[PDB]
Amino acid sequence: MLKAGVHFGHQTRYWNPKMKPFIFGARNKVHIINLEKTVPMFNEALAELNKIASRKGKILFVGTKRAASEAVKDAALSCDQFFVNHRWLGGMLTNWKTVRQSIKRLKDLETQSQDGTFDKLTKKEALMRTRELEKLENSLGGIKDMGGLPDALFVIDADHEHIAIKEANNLGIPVFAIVDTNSDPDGVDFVIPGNDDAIRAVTLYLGAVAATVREGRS
Amino acid sequence: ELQEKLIAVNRVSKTVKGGRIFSFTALTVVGDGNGRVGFGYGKAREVPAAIQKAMEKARRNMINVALNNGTLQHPVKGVHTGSRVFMQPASEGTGIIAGGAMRAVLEVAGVHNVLAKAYGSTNPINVVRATIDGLENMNSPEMVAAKRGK
Amino acid sequence: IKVRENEPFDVALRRFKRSCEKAGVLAEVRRREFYEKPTTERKRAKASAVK
RNA sequence: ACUAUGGUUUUUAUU
RNA sequence: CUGCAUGGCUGUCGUCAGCUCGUGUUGUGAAAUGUUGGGUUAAGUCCCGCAACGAGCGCAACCCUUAUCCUUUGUUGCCAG
RNA sequence: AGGCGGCCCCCUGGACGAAGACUGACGCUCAGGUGCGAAAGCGUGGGGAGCAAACAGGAUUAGAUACCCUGGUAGUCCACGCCGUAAACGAUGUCGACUUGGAGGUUGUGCCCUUGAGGCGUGGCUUCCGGAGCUAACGCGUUAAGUCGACCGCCUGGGGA
Questions:
Q1: Which residues touch strand D (CB under 7 A)?
Q2: Hey, which family's this protein in (chain C)?
């Protein structure tokens, strides 16, 4: 990859002192990453993701916030991937042996929807199962055929989903995170410095893995 | 073949309307008899099922130990909160020694030659966390051959 | 203390009380408070658009 | 309006 | 004669809305969570939401009874022609 | 340290600064010594408006030598001495160096049209949060209970003391 996405920095400090190796000279206290410390660095990690895709490892895409909550389930869907757009239901990795009962619920409500088992002129009972199904779609709809756990996790904001990153560290699961200047990398296993909101950054690595889960191999 | 050992089990109670209810909290170890060891802690009703509940973790947790001529290459500390244990090697003969929680960890790894002392809290559920911190603190097993000269 | 303003009449309305600073409506105080809320709610989350 | 004081003793808990 | 020996029987909080079984997480651990919060109900109600999510016992339902129309059927009941 | 407070003009120790100069380890702590008081008290005489132990009464209560109310002496104040004790608390013994951060003040000094609601440097201070570190857990956090060193006192279960 090479340059583009020209930006001027946003917010001040609003920072983590761990980020010294990634930041440029600040003007008017407004802080920015250095393009020469970040673009070659995430291009060097784009190959690490392509190797997991060449081993057919199942990748989970997490984007629970406004800049990525549509793109997480469209920007790479032409290459088939698993996604979370708002919520996990919770304990999704360490309590999966229980949380699978809501995947069993989604399977039952879909085998009912697919045949019209509740489609009647008795509307309140039809809406009862419609609302419960369309509520499960929003948390489990992007992971219902993942057949087990992920082999890698990709997350848009490590300050927001830190409880599931704590699960991933306990289970030995790789974590790729586009950490912002005001985030923290200690729970992250593949650091690829970026942003969580505003610009011209939050869907940048997402727009690049959309080919490296198809090219290879893959 | 792998080996299983109990350290301790203790009664734990909750006071309620019309009396009291109780469970057991157990502490166990699992080892290979040659240099791998792990520990389990857990709480359930009945001693054998509290031991089974502690073994849930001992079937996952393990440390592989760095050794040189059947014993330790160096003296080392192990730390967790108020537990501040110390380990040092012994010669071929007597060498085990140590209290019921530290002795169990040395037994199941075949490391029957270490003068282990607690030098802090002896509390079984915390001196175990300090013991396995010391087994993680061990430096690599051929280090004298790397460290010679420059 | 001010209030030297010459109105021969008591007014059947609130004009300076219970709504601006030292409670109610603004600068609320006690009546049960929450301490995990400031470390739980940071950014919206709703209002764009509910409708 | 306000509204004094309380004699002695008190579970088996196993592997 | 003893519920200071008990199996059973039983009063009652109370129709009060609350309680268990498990798995996860946090905490040195007892313990916490969820069962806390925001509306709102007779009600964990009916939705929303947080590191807590399933399966049970309650709540709610099942079964019984009634206001008006239509139908089936009438003596030892009824009586408009 | 205790603490220090209307203003005005004085007497006066300490601290901080810029350019120079003169010393050349003069740096730290300290057994026993030798010295500071908030308030109340004393030794001796003055001064005496609030206020106020005691004293003197009332109320309340079955009782009230207390609460509460009504009067009120020592005392509070000034000189020359004594008392040496406190949450003297930031529950943090004392000297230096080393250290990723956020937010807010106080005061020198160097260069700039201060053509800047000052700015970028350089010195001395000072407050609320917060990450590494510490720890039984609470608490401490660059002004640390951290880190590495130097020194002086005391403690070893409580009652009894």
A1: B 11, 15, 19-20, 22, 24, 46-48
A2: Belongs to the bacterial ribosomal protein bS21 family.
